[PDB]
């Protein structure tokens, strides 16, 4: 299975946030650790994306674009999976050194978002998502959010996305077509559910960036730039998710 072989081969390892668990939880400490984790994971997302079949055939400006728009969804989905596989969705496993119980969900001031992410995590159990389905789905999330006015080379993006949809379909395909159809429906619905969550997190981090000096939250280099230049394009509707089903 050439494609799946590649996805498993390139899958990033464990990333720690660097969080001090010996200190009492505070809003500022938790969010500063999340922001650092974001920066660390972004580095891994770039190295991963570059190794995905067909990715480097995109225009370099489109490579930049998809990474800068898709990262929240990619990272949320992966965290949901870690949470499912490591703690049966009981807590949010952001990193081995940054695990959110309900108290931290409250302290973070992102409780509503956390609950939705935990629901997402539970869906991996409820649907019995396989590791191989997870890998293909995550890859597809990189190609699930683009500018409304299209990319630099839309045709190449369209072919790439089409081929990642095909690979997911093949992983699903089960003698009975009705089971394959129900499965594809379930998984595309799950994929779609990532985007509203990512949007709420995008809103939160944008607002937090705008007031970060007031609340003592540190944003690293790339994250602060992405959140001020790219994220508002999502928030203003210039960049939108590609949904399977209508919202």
């Amino acid at each position: 299975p050439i494609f799946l072989n590649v996805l498993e081969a390139i899958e990033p390892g464990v990333v720690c946030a660097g969080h001090d668990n010996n200190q009492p939880d505070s809003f500022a400490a938790l969010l500063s650790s999340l922001n650092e984790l974001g920066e660390r994971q972004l580095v891994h997302v770039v190295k991963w994306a570059k190794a995905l079949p067909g990715f480097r055939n995109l225009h370099v400006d489109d490579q930049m674009a998809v990474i800068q728009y898709s990262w929240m969804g990619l990272m949320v989905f992966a965290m949901g999976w870690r949470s499912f596989t490591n703690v049966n969705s009981r807590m949010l496993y952001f990193a081995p050194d940054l695990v959110f119980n309900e108290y931290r969900m409250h302290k973070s001031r992102m409780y509503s978002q956390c609950v939705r992410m935990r629901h997402l995590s539970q869906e991996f159990g409820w649907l019995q998502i396989t590791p191989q389905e997870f890998l293909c789905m995550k890859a597809l999330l990189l190609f699930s959010i683009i500018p409304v006015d299209g990319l630099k080379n839309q045709k190449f993006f369209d072919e790439l996305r089409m081929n990642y949809i095909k690979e997911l379909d093949r992983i699903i395909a089960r003698k009975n077509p009705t089971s394959c159809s129900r499965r594809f429906y379930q998984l595309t619905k799950l994929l779609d559910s990532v985007q509203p969550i990512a949007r709420e997190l995008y809103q939160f981090t944008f607002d937090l960036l705008i007031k970060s000096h007031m609340v003592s939250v540190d944003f690293p280099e790339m994250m602060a730039e992405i959140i001020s230049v790219q994220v508002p394009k999502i928030l203003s509707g210039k960049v939108k998710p590609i949904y399977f089903h209508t919202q």
Partner: peptide, 13 residues
Amino acid sequence: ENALLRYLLDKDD
């Protein structure tokens, strides 16, 4: 243009 991100994308490592 995000210079730091483009560097990561351009970098072989």
